[PDB]
Design a protein around this ligand. Structure first.
Ligand SMILES: [Cl-]
Ligand SMILES: [Cl-]
Ligand code: NA
Ligand code: NA
Length: 129
């Protein structure tokens, strides 16, 4: 599913991401835009052989099991395919674990390079939330 901007913002609010660990909703919407273009099906392979999955591009080395990333961990205890669903619950629950692991949203490269230090509230402007 390709979400609209305000549709995704509302879904992320419903799932508890607004101000989760101090990150306002616009940060999460901005990260999703640049990680996946709001597409739950997005996948991208990395040089080390791991793969990123879903709307927030969660990496199989650490967070999910895709059956082809040797020695990796499954810290969210889920198959990576679960992160491609039109229902964002599994992606959100896993992201909550990631953002709590000490490095905050700096774990998402696109957030650090394209959202951090910008007016992220613009990503939710105009939306009924
Ligand atoms: Cl959803
Ligand atoms: Cl933080
Ligand atoms: Na915001
Ligand atoms: Na893994």
């Amino acid at each position: 599913k390709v979400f609209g901007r305000c549709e995704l913002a509302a879904a992320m609010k419903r799932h508890g991401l607004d101000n989760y660990r101090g990150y306002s909703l616009g940060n999460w919407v901005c990260a999703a835009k640049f990680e996946s273009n709001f597409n739950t099906q997005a996948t991208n392979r990395n040089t080390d052989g791991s793969t990123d999955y879903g709307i927030l591009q969660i990496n199989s080395r650490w967070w999910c099991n895709d059956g082809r990333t040797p020695g990796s961990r499954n810290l969210c205890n889920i198959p990576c395919s679960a992160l491609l669903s039109s229902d964002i619950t599994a992606s959100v629950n896993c992201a909550k674990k990631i953002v709590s692991d000490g490095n905050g949203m700096n774990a998402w490269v696109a957030w650090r390079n394209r959202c951090k230090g910008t007016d992220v509230q613009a990503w939710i402007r105009g939306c009924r939330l």
